[PDB]
Design a protein around this nucleic acid. Structure first.
Lengths: 247, 247
DNA sequence: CTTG
DNA sequence: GGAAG
DNA sequence: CTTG
DNA sequence: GGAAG
């Protein structure tokens, strides 16, 4: 089956991803920015116990590390959500290169009606952050019944950061450039972590999907085996139902 | 003096005006209009005693007369103010021909710096209403301590009627047409009931003002002797101060 | 009085 | 709510 | 939690 | 006030 043939490509069997070909990202600040340190709002025990196993898993994975940083933004409550709005304001803008889904789907011709849809799991976390940029994203973590108060920060591209979708989309485009060159018959649409492969025949779509999964896993990305729509005539992609070249 | 030389022209000495050359006005209705009868809101004794001497004076002058009309609009409280909004909605629109004061003053050249300013008193009441149009403006009048409940209406162009300023301005323009032809040296600005005469010299402005007062009184209009600004180098007209050709 |  | 009729 |  | 981080 598809799960056994590509253990590296699926998040279920391949471990947390890491885009090994992508250099750790440096995040340039605006010309006048200085660090901002926002105090952590006290959070209830209920919220803290809910967040704690997530933080611990991220620490175990090396996605969070301890730090001391002049930057600090608050965590809110369960799973942690960081309010990065004051960091976002101080980070230099980049051109938005992610196409809107309407325009992205215009590149889907009627000759290609066999579809494979993959969604990458924990996509942003596959991209490393350069150590010089890690302090930007620090937050406070308290363990009252352990007695650890200090900051943690991210070693990977974080959720809530304004440039994460664009930086991820650009990174994956670099990493799939050769796949496109090696498979000029296939149509590959990329929308951040949502991928559509289109082919002429079931065999072609089958062979391309095998190549794409092999490529994604080798590069360090991980797709959701549970959500994958593999070699179907009808798929759901980006909120559309793709059927008979329609929509 | 100016008051003794032109007794007919001044409201103080000439009686209520009546534009004897102007035919009684017929007020056309919109194509779909039918009469509207709005109930008179009960008014306090204090308001009624305040309004009463005004109504009685207008009755004595023949400006109000008794009637029975399918139209009725309310009086509000002291001096009476009629709410003619529902009549105004049913009366056919006319082109607004009264110039705005800014544009009206553009016709004042610097060669004419001697001014006379007159304001006509009770101007609208100088224009008669045709008996066919009188019922349009009816209202209810109650005298509880006399025991008279019934309608009255206007025999002259009423306050609060949307076309009164334009109809009056057009009427006075017809009546002063010959004065303009007989005095081509003078500048005469008309803004409804507010008149400015301009001349080159004090003698000219003096002679023109004598002619204008004689003409106005003969036609049945009445100017306020108290407010008149006669043959001055500096006058207030339409909210402006006219001095040295400025403003 | 009702209709920024 | 105050400007208007 | 703050920021038609 | 609820959509966002």
């Amino acid at each position: 089956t598809w799960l056994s043939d590509f253990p590296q490509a699926w998040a279920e069997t391949g471990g947390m991803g890491l885009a090994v070909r992508q250099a750790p990202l440096i995040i340039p600040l605006k010309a006048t920015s200085t660090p901002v340190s926002i105090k952590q709002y006290p959070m209830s025990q209920e919220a803290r116990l809910g967040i704690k196993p997530h933080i611990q898993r991220l620490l175990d994975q090396g996605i969070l590390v301890p730090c001391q940083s002049p930057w600090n933004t608050p965590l809110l409550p369960y799973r942690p959500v960081q309010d990065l709005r004051e960091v976002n304001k101080r980070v230099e803008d980049i051109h938005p290169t992610v196409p809107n889904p309407y325009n992205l789907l215009s590149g889907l011709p009627p000759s290609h009606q066999w579809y494979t849809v993959l969604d990458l799991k924990d996509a942003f976390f596959c991209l490393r952050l350069h150590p010089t940029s890690q302090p930007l994203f620090a937050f406070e973590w308290r363990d009252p019944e352990m007695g650890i108060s200090g900051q943690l920060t991210w070693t990977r591209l974080p959720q809530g950061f304004k440039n994460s979708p664009t930086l991820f989309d650009e990174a994956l485009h670099r990493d799939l450039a050769d796949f496109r060159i090696q498979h000029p018959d296939l149509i590959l649409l990329q929308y951040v972590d949502d991928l559509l492969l289109a082919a002429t025949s079931e065999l072609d779509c089958q062979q391309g999907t095998r190549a794409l999964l092999q490529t994604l896993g080798n590069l360090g990305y991980r797709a959701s085996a549970k959500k994958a729509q593999i070699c179907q005539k009808q798929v759901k992609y980006l909120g559309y139902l793709l059927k008979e070249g329609q929509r």
